Amino acid sequence: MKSLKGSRTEKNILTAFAGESQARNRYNYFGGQAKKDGFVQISDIFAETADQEREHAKRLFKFLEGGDLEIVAAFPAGIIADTHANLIASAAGEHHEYTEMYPSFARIAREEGYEEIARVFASIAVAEEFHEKRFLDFARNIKEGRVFLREQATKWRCRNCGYVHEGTGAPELCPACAHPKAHFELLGINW
């Protein structure tokens, strides 16, 4: 470290901040479309990813010490589509970020004496890979019609009321809260 002011890293941070800020918005918009599309678990993961982008941007933004600063950079100009498409566009952009943008940025940060920032750019990359992974599995189940249907009987959980259900597919309506299949997910345990 030292001072960012005038460095290339300084513009890289702002550019990342600008792209991650926009990603938060798009993921929130993508989450609202997934809810409309009937994918509540996917809606909440967009919303979760949005929130996690907010936190990536926050860490970066706190690096800056400065005033206004001009950046040249390209950004998706649109667009909000169907959920599958939203998930793939999201995946693609996460992809460029972790395979391209952040590795470079990291490099230069490193290569300007900003190794902490360097670490942070690499660390966010990790998150972005998982984000990608996640978006892709979900796109694939949507593609393979396996969101609400699996080939062996398994357990599904109602996200709305916690009702658990044994079967190959989620129910068309929660016996407990009477919410529709959209609220069902594969029951998972991570503790």
Residue positions forming the annotated binding site for Fe(3+): 20, 53, 94, 97, 128, 131, 158, 161, 174, 177
Return all residues near 9 (Cβ < 8 A) that are at least 6 apart.
Answer: 105, 108, 109, 112, 114, 117
- Under rule CB under 5 A, which residues in 51-80 are in contact with Zn ion? 53, 56
List beta partners, residue 111. none
Q: Report how many residues bind its own copies under the rule CB under 8 A.
A: 34
Measure CA of the first residue to CA of the last residue in the chain; give whole Å.
Answer: 38
In the complex with its own copies, the residue whose CB is nearer, 60 or 158, is 60
Which among Fe ion, Zn ion, its own copies, none contacts residue 92 (Cβ within 5 to 8 A by kind)? none
- Under rule CB under 5 A, which residues in 25-64 are in contact with Fe ion? none
Per-residue binder mask for its own copies (CB under 8 A), 52-81, x = binder: --x--xx--xx-xxxxxxxxxxxxxxxxx-
Token pair belonging to 102? 């952040």
Burial of 175 (0-12, 13-18, 19+ CB in 10 A): exposed
Q: Does 28 bind its own copies (CB under 8 A)?
A: yes
Which of these ranges, 60-68, 100-108, 115-123, 162-170, lies near Fe ion under the rule CB under 5 A?
162-170
In the complex with Zn ion, the residue whose CB is nearer, 26 or 183, is 26
| DSSP labels, 91-126 | HHHHHHIIIIIHHHHHHHHHTTT-HHHHHHHHHHHH
Q: Does 132 bind Zn ion (CB under 5 A)?
A: no
Classified as helix, coil or strand, 186 is strand
Tell me which residues touch Zn ion (CB under 5 A): 20, 53, 56
